[PDB]
Every structure is written in structure tokens, then in C-alpha cells.
Amino acid sequence: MTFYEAVGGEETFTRLARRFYEGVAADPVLRPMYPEEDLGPAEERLRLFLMQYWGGPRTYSERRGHPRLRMRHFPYRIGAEERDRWLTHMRAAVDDLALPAHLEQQLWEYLVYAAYAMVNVPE
Ligand code: HEM
């Protein structure tokens, strides 16, 4: 019984990636930063990544290799502003998930830390 299975498995992340990406999609600043006309495959990459990370299927890494996230975000201008907006849509996406307090909190803390860590603009 992993964290993965406990929070609701695959359909929880689908829900989370989906709700996060609607928030991202409708963001004046974040949206033009996702350089795809179609945001479907980006959603998908997130969904899979989160699954894998929390102890679900290793699909992400069998499709793309290692996550090396800080490396993969290297092309992008991720400063305090971009991070804070990313967070706003994650919070909203986590909230809608309506997970039990402790499971919510662990997932949130991770997401917070990871974004804080993703900031890569010497500033
Ligand atoms: C901190 C603010 C962040 C910004 C502005 C940001 C921005 C982006 C952008 C523009 C892309 C490419 C999307 C595309 O393909 O069109 C991307 C990819 C991705 N992001 Fe972030 N990101 C942030 C933080 C995070 C965090 C905290 C996580 C994970 C917990 C994450 C997970 C991913 C993953 C898994 C990909 C695709 C990885 C792959 O290429 O296989 N990002 N991000």
C-alpha cells in the first residue's frame, strides 16, 4: 500500500495534471511559456511523472529517461513570479482533489519544494 494507491492512484494524478493545466492554460504569464500550441502531451508528461514519483507506474521513465527535472526546465525562465503562478494553479489543482489532510499536505509540500527548487533564474 503505497502513497500512490492511497491518494487514489492514477485517476488522482489525471485529475491533478488536468486541473493544474486548465489553470496553467488560462494564465496570461505561464501560458505563453508552454511553447506548444497543443498542451495535451505536456499534461500527459506531468501526469505520468507524478505517478511514477509517488510510487505508481514507471511509465514516465520508460518513455522519457530519468526525470532530471532541473535539467529539463533549463531552457525556461523560471523566476519567483513564474514559480508563484505555477504554485497558484497547483494549489487550486490540489484543493479540488479534496484529499485527506495528511496525504494532501505531503503532496503539497513536495510540489512547493520542487517548484522552489525549479527556480533557475540567477535573480
Ligand atoms: C516552478 C515553476 C515551473 C514552471 C514555470 C515550469 C515550466 C515548464 C514548462 C514551460 C515545461 C515544458 C512544457 C511543454 O512541453 O510545453 C515544463 C515541463 C515539465 N515540468 Fe515544469 N515548470 C515548473 C515547475 C515544475 C515542478 C515543481 C514540477 C514537478 C513536481 C514540474 C514538472 C514538469 C515535468 C515532469 C515536465 C516534462 C518533463 C519531461 O520533459 O519529460 N515542473 N515545465
Side-chain angles (χ1 to χ4, degrees), residues 8 31-32 36 44 55 64 67 74 81 86 91 100 111 118 120:
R31 167 76 265 217
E36 295 182 341
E44 192 59 30
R64 339 224 74 205
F74 191 70
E81 182 164 323
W86 190 97
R91 182 68 270 178
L111 264 4
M118 215 74 59
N120 67 17

Side-chain angles (χ1 to χ4, degrees), residues 33-36 49 60 64 72-73 76 86 110 114-115 118:
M33 300 206 42
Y34 296 67
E36 295 182 341
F49 163 79
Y60 172 87
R64 339 224 74 205
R72 287 156 110 103
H73 288 86
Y76 312 109
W86 190 97
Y110 166 71
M118 215 74 59

Side-chain angles (χ1 to χ4, degrees), residues 20-21 30 33-36 38-39 41-42 45-46 49-50 60 64 66-67 69 72-73 76-79 82-84 86-87 90 110-116 118-119:
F20 164 74
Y21 260 93
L30 294 186
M33 300 206 42
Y34 296 67
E36 295 182 341
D38 181 30
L39 283 191
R45 281 180 216 94
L46 218 215
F49 163 79
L50 288 170
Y60 172 87
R64 339 224 74 205
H66 294 315
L69 285 195
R72 287 156 110 103
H73 288 86
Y76 312 109
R77 179 202 337 104
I78 323 203
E82 287 76 7
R83 164 250 293 153
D84 287 343
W86 190 97
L87 285 165
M90 254 315 169
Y110 166 71
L111 264 4
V112 168
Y113 273 88
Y116 270 82
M118 215 74 59
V119 174

Side-chain angles (χ1 to χ4, degrees), residues 4 9-25 30 34 36 38-61 63-65 67 69 72-73 85-94 97 107-108 110-112 114-115 118:
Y4 179 78
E10 221 207 26
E11 353 221 299
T12 296
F13 298 96
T14 296
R15 272 206 99 298
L16 176 84
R18 186 139 163 72
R19 308 301 173 239
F20 164 74
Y21 260 93
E22 304 149 17
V24 158
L30 294 186
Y34 296 67
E36 295 182 341
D38 181 30
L39 283 191
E43 273 226 9
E44 192 59 30
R45 281 180 216 94
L46 218 215
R47 205 190 60 102
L48 287 179
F49 163 79
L50 288 170
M51 280 169 197
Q52 168 171 316
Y53 178 88
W54 293 107
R58 300 265 320 183
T59 312
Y60 172 87
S61 264
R63 295 197 192 166
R64 339 224 74 205
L69 285 195
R72 287 156 110 103
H73 288 86
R85 297 171 105 117
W86 190 97
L87 285 165
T88 301
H89 308 119
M90 254 315 169
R91 182 68 270 178
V94 170
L97 221 35
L107 180 58
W108 182 234
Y110 166 71
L111 264 4
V112 168
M118 215 74 59

